[PDB]
């Protein structure tokens, strides 16, 4: 199936790879692009897997969802008709984009511009993108628990995880989410909606004082925790898991503070590990501070190799070295890498945003360096507001709380890098007419 040579080779079949393929085809008409994906699915977007796909009846099979406005669409970036087969990729007139599903790149040879797949086949390339993303982390307490505890613990990232968990929500009476970040909180609201209708139980526990405490200031994290609780979720903050075992057919979670939680299924949402296995054979540098492949401002690692998406630790000329795990960042960085694979030599400049919805009622957007450890200034009108994240009297990140269609304004504030004497006047740019943390 796989051709022996391809001009553009993209490793990984996710958001960053698809955005690069589209970018290569737009900037280089007639380009021949091969995506190698270890997953069996064609490229698809992940945000709906914890949101819109849960707020729909045949959705598990169709994988179509209604945006909050009402317009329906598919989770796949393009229908299969958009792609061509890998075998025919060298011969089709005006080229195309092919995906080799079910195949993993296991070896990378930078000197000879060659990769080896898990089935032994070898592919040479002229330009290559590493877009391998990451794999969910698991808790040490779950790893040492046993095969039964591990078989009843879900690490949520893929279409298969959505389907297996959606079925579980219709079979068991109690599901426990471990993790207070974006993913855990969105799954809590999603599973909580399903549980109100079926009369089941949803628990969310995490070590922080409130949901997304590592990201939002304490007061807003606490407000968010109460919103999640009003969705029918039992939220247990300040919870550190000591051990997990099976007791009377149920899962028993023992916390360090002495509390105990009985449940039927566990969903672990405790972060991501960048997929950097190819750095060994490839001789590529990994970043010990942020993880991931270390690349420069143009997302380049070596002469004919770029890295994009969750796996790329890059140099932001304005904000410094970073690694970002956002859907839009994978789109922006994948697109940029694609342009640089066709001669652009452009640095990461356009700042990608992220968003989170805890239902169709609570939503927030964000841009830049967003970290609750940074000094923050929040101007609210509760209901809505804007939180500025500061570094040396300069706004380096913004969180928009239930304020939409104003991300271009936030993007400009980060870019301009002004020293603002009155942030209440800057908040007026977001139609907000003050808390510190
Ligand atoms: C459930 C969920 C909800 C999310 N919601 C949001 C949201 O609301 N807002 C937001 O901003 N972000 C959200 N994100 C984050 C966003 O989805 C990620 O930032 C984005 O998917 C990263 O794209 P990527 O291309 O870098 O990696 P991935 O999408 O992970 O793609 C990597 C692909 O490469 C494959 N691969 C890995 N190694 C190899 C190899 N050696 N050979 C072949 N293939 C390989 C992997 O199997 C995977 O198929 C969400 C993520 C998840 C999981
Ligand atoms: C930056 C970001 C924002 C989200 N809303 C999100 C939701 C689920 C899983 C994730 F990894 C997420 N990451």
Residue numbers in the entry: 127 to 182, 185 to 509, 560 to 611, 616 to 619
From the paper:
A 60-kDa FAD-dependent oxidoreductase, AIF allosterically switches between two distinct redox states. NADH binding by the oxidized AIF monomer reduces its FAD cofactor at a centralized active site, allosterically disrupting hydrogen bond networks to release a 50-residue surface loop (C-loop) and stimulate dimerization at the AIF surface. Oxidized NAD+ and reduced FADH– form a long-lived charge-transfer complex (CTC), which stabilizes and maintains the reduced dimeric state of AIF. NADH-activated AIF dimers support import of OXPHOS subunits by CHCHD4 and are critical for mitochondrial function.
To understand how SAXS CX1 and CX2 chemotypes engage AIF and enable dimerization, we crystallized select fragment hits with the W196A dimer-permissive mutant and wild-type AIF. Crystal structures of the W196A mutant bound to CX1 fragments and the underlying 4-aminoquinoline (4AQ) scaffold revealed that these scaffolds localize to the NADH active site, mirroring the native NADH ligand, as do CX1 and CX2 scaffolds bound to the wild-type protein. To accommodate this amine interaction, the aromatic side chain of F482 must rotate out of the binding site. Aligned with this, AIF structures with CX1 and CX2 ligands exhibiting partial occupancy indicate mixed orientations of the F482 aromatic ring. Crystallographic complexes of CX1 and CX2 fragments with AIF(W196A) (C12, D3 and D1) or wild-type AIF (C9, C11 and D7) reveal stabilizing active site contacts and sources of steric interference that correlate with AIF dimerization rates. By contrast, methyl substitution at position 3 (fragments C9 and C11) and methoxy substitution at position 6 (fragment D7) slow allosteric transition. Introducing methyl at position 3 for fluorinated analogs C9 and C11 prevents formation of a C12-like fluorine-π contact, as the methyl (C9) or amine (C11) of the rotated scaffold will clash with L311 on the opposite side of the active site. In their observed orientation, the methyl substitutions interfere with aromatic edge contacts to F482 and H454, which presumably slows stimulated AIF dimerization.
